[PDB]
Amino acid sequence: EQTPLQEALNQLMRQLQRKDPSAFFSFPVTDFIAPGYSMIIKHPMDFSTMKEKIKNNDYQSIEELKDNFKLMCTNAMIYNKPETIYYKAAKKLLHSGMKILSQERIQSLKQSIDFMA
Ligand SMILES: COc1cc(-c2cn(C)c(=O)c3cnccc23)c(OC)cc1CN(C)C
């Protein structure tokens, strides 16, 4: 049993992950694979962490998940240099995700979520 908000967050997450077929952002970045990461990025974020916050009913709004998604992309553009594959992939994923999490779409979900209460 999940709330209408949780299920909306899940379908949004499914579409966001559709824009990352390489699974660069599926799991947390470790210092082992990216040395000094924990010293450079103060608020790490990834898809699996966001999915756990959905599962635990941590998000009170779609905008909070939108904030976490922007943070995950921004983190990769801080740690990685502009020509790297990870920077370019985060740049493109952020732009694609902002179209998915547009105000127009958040609108429609808020009303249907409200109508199920
Ligand atoms: C290339 O393969 C991967 C890359 C990254 C990765 C992501 N981001 C955002 C980074 O900034 C980053 C920076 N340095 C090194 C690696 C990464 C990854 O993160 C956990 C996992 C894989 C393995 N994958 C098959 C699951």
Swiss-Prot record:
Residues 1-104 form the Bromo domain. It is found in: Nucleus; Chromosome. There is a cross-link at K55, K66, K70, K81, K110 (Glycyl lysine isopeptide (Lys-Gly) (interchain with G-Cter in SUMO2)). It comes from the Eukaryota. Interacts with TRIM24, PTPN13 and DVL1. Identified in a complex with SMARCA4/BRG1, SMARCC1/BAF155, SMARCE1/BAF57, DPF2/BAF45D and ARID2, subunits of the SWI/SNF-B (PBAF) chromatin remodeling complex. Interacts with IRF2 and HNRPUL1. Interacts (via N-terminus) with TP53. Interacts (via C-terminus) with EP300. Interacts with BRCA1. Interacts (via bromo domain) with histone H3 (via N-terminus) acetylated at 'Lys-14' (H3K14ac). Has low affinity for histone H3 acetylated at 'Lys-9' (H3K9ac). Acts both as coactivator and as corepressor. May play a role in chromatin remodeling. Activator of the Wnt signaling pathway in a DVL1-dependent manner by negatively regulating the GSK3B phosphotransferase activity. Induces dephosphorylation of GSK3B at 'Tyr-216'. Down-regulates TRIM24-mediated activation of transcriptional activation by AR. Transcriptional corepressor that down-regulates the expression of target genes. Binds to target promoters, leading to increased histone H3 acetylation at 'Lys-9' (H3K9ac). Binds to the ESR1 promoter. Recruits BRCA1 and POU2F1 to the ESR1 promoter. This is Bromodomain-containing protein 7. It comes from Homo sapiens (Human). The gene is BRD7. The chain holds residues 132 to 248 of 651 of the full protein.
